[PDB]
Amino acid sequence: SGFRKMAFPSGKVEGCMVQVTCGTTTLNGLWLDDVVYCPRHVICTSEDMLNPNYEDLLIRKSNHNFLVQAGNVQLRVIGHSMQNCVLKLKVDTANPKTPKYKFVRIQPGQTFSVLACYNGSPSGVYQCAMRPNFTIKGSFLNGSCGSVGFNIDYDCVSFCYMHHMELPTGVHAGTDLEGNFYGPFVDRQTAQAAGTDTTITVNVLAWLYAAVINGDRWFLNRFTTTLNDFNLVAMKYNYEPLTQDHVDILGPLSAQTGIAVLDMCASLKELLQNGMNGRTILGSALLEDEFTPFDVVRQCSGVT
Amino acid sequence: SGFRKMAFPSGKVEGCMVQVTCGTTTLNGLWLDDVVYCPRHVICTSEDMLNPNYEDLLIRKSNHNFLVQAGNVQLRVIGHSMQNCVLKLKVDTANPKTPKYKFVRIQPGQTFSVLACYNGSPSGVYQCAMRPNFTIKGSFLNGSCGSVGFNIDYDCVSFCYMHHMELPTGVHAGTDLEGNFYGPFVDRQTAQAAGTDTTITVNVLAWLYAAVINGDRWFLNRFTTTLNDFNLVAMKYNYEPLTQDHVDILGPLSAQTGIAVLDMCASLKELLQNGMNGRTILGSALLEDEFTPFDVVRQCSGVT
Ligand SMILES: Cc1ccncc1NC(=O)Cc1cccc(O[C@@H]2CC(=O)N2)c1
Numbered sequence: 001s002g003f004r005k006m007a008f009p010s011g012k013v014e015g016c017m018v019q020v021t022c023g024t025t026t027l028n029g030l031w032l033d034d035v036v037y038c039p040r041h042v043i044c045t046s047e048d049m050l051n052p053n054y055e056d057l058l059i060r061k062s063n064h065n066f067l068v069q070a071g072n073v074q075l076r077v078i079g080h081s082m083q084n085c086v087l088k089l090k091v092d093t094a095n096p097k098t099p100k101y102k103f104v105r106i107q108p109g110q111t112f113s114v115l116a117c118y119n120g121s122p123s124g125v126y127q128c129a130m131r132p133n134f135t136i137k138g139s140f141l142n143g144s145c146g147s148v149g150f151n152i153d154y155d156c157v158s159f160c161y162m163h164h165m166e167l168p169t170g171v172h173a174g175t176d177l178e179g180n181f182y183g184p185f186v187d188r189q190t191a192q193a194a195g196t197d198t199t200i201t202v203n204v205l206a207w208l209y210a211a212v213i214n215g216d217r218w219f220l221n222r223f224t225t226t227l228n229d230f231n232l233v234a235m236k237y238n239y240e241p242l243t244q245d246h247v248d249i250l251g252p253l254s255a256q257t258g259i260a261v262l263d264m265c266a267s268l269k270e271l272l273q274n275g276m277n278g279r280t281i282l283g284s285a286l287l288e289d290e291f292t293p294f295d296v297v298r299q300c301s302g303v304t
Numbered sequence: 305s306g307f308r309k310m311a312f313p314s315g316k317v318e319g320c321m322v323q324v325t326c327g328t329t330t331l332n333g334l335w336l337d338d339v340v341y342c343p344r345h346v347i348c349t350s351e352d353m354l355n356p357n358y359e360d361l362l363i364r365k366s367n368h369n370f371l372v373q374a375g376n377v378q379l380r381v382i383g384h385s386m387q388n389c390v391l392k393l394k395v396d397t398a399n400p401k402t403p404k405y406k407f408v409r410i411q412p413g414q415t416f417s418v419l420a421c422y423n424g425s426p427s428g429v430y431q432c433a434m435r436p437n438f439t440i441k442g443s444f445l446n447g448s449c450g451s452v453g454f455n456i457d458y459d460c461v462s463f464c465y466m467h468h469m470e471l472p473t474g475v476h477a478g479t480d481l482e483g484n485f486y487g488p489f490v491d492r493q494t495a496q497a498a499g500t501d502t503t504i505t506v507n508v509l510a511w512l513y514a515a516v517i518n519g520d521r522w523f524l525n526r527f528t529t530t531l532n533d534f535n536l537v538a539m540k541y542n543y544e545p546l547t548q549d550h551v552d553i554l555g556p557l558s559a560q561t562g563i564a565v566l567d568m569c570a571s572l573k574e575l576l577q578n579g580m581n582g583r584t585i586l587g588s589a590l591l592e593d594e595f596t597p598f599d600v601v602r603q604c605s606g607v608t
Pocket residue numbers: 041049140141142143144145164165166167168186187188189190191192305
């Protein structure tokens with residue numbers, strides 16, 4: 001028992017972190033096979049970031065201008081190319097520590113672990129969620145660009161995020177490993193504001209199931225609701241509308257606890273309308289939305 | 305910017321996790337050099353756990369009865385000994401992945417990362433704190449025993465915890481790597497209740513400094529207090545008494561923000577007396593006490 005914001009073990013990803021330097025800028029790169037992936041803004045100066053023409057900036061750059069270092073050893077760069085907002089540096093050595101991997105573009109509401117790195121060295125690991133407004137609420141400082149987000153299935157690492165920028169609001173934006181930004185963000189030091197950050201309803205419900213499984217049951221009530229009635233409440237509180245697909249994914253948790261999905265929705269509804277009244281749920285004084293129904297099942301069953 | 309409950313990268317510790325089986329019981333072991341450390345209750349049956357005589361139970365056990373497996377390969381056990389509540393299984397092969405390491409017994413209020421394992425395989429990593437009542441609020445299921453807690457300084461892993469048991473209250477108890485339990489707990493399936501869980505005041509203050517550094521300043525007020533006055537409030541709210549040693553450790557955070565420690569104490573005092581009034585601090589609706597002043601400096605400076 002107990003329930004924690006748990007990240008995947010990061011070892012398979014630590015073995016892929018390298019340092020990429022271009023001119024005066026140093027950031028993190030991801031070394032998989034003979035390719036090093038990193039944010040394309042590694043080629044920019046602080047002046048360039050105001051209105052960068054990446055195709056023009058890359059013309060003035062040769063293979064020898066990209067310094068790639070894995071630990072204390074230098075990798076020889078034999079090719080370079082831009083794919084959307086990432087640079088792919090072909091090195092002459094395949095990474096011997098490359099795990100089984102995939103590049104996956106995640107959906108909003110899905111969770112992932114981040115291995116924050118500086119100068120190609122890992123500093124920490126934490127669990128994140130892709131917000132419905134396509135930002136992530138991470139912990140990143142200058143030098144953290146190129147840090148990756150990922151999920152692990154047995155021995156396969158699914159890379160889903162690469163950190164590129166911090167918005168003036170302190171929230172984070174980045175790309176998938178094909179260099180496509182999540183959301184409308186661009187790699188330019190220009191005014192970019194995030195949209196409305198809605199709450200991931202299906203994740204809050206999954207966390208309510210985790211709370212019941214772990215002993216915190218005070219919020220269970222004698223009521224039920226319908227999807228349409230629940231969604232009227234969800235709209236008023238900037239919660240994502242709950243669909244039958246969401247109800248379906250909550251099925252294993254509903255079966256385990258014996259609490260119908262719509263009954264748990266009625267508990268959520270009263271929690272939204274009345275608040276916690278000074279109480280906590282799984283040591284939290286607010287409704288947690290960064291555990292998917294998969295994370296709850298995984299944590300409560302011990303999938304390694 | 306941003307502030308997250310961040311754990312250390314777990315790779316150096318993943319390379320040490322093995323599976324230890326004795327009779328019908330399987331738990332996790334820590335393989336460092338030619339020694340595998342694991343909880344001594346691996347030798348017990350469910351009936352034995354009621355009143356186990358570990359010295360007598362160990363008499364009926366030989367080197368060949370301890371099955372140690374690292375991944376898919378079996379380790380040959382050439383020695384076994386009991387040190388307090390841990391067994392030390394001498395194997396004939398030094399772990400090639402052994403990092404630089406120390407065994408350290410941590411103080412209450414100090415934080416550490418846990419790598420939860422099942423069958424010698426890592427499932428997740430999370431950040432914990434040794435509670436003032438010597439329990440930890442972790443996430444552990446049956447099979448997780450032998451999972452370790454640790455800190456990393458550059459390339460040195462300081463092992464500080466080994467998971468042994470879950471109390472009927474859902475909180476966790478365990479030992480340092482010399483087999484000495486933190487707190488009064490014993491490895492026996494008997495009635496054991498934890499003492500009063502007090503709040504780690506110096507950590508709450510350090511987290512208030514992290515909030516100021518990250519933009520959340522609403523809680524800053526026009527007041528100050530004294531150590532004695534603050535401690536009268538801290539006592540009423542089951543908070544650890546703040547000492548001059550605590551004020552001293554908060555010095556770098558006080559210097560960085562320009563907010564005197566006693567001024568931050570007055571903010572904490574009003575927060576304790578009036579609550580959050582529906583507001584949040586670093587995305588939390590309660591006062592967080594699982595970040596030491598060292599964790600705040602580390603996270604806000606990017607120590608890798
Ligand atoms: C310093 C830091 C800290 C944490 N995480 C990342 C960074 N770095 C950056 O943000 C550099 C950068 C890269 C692309 C675009 C860009 O402009 C953004 C877009 C907007 O509003 N400001 C800036």
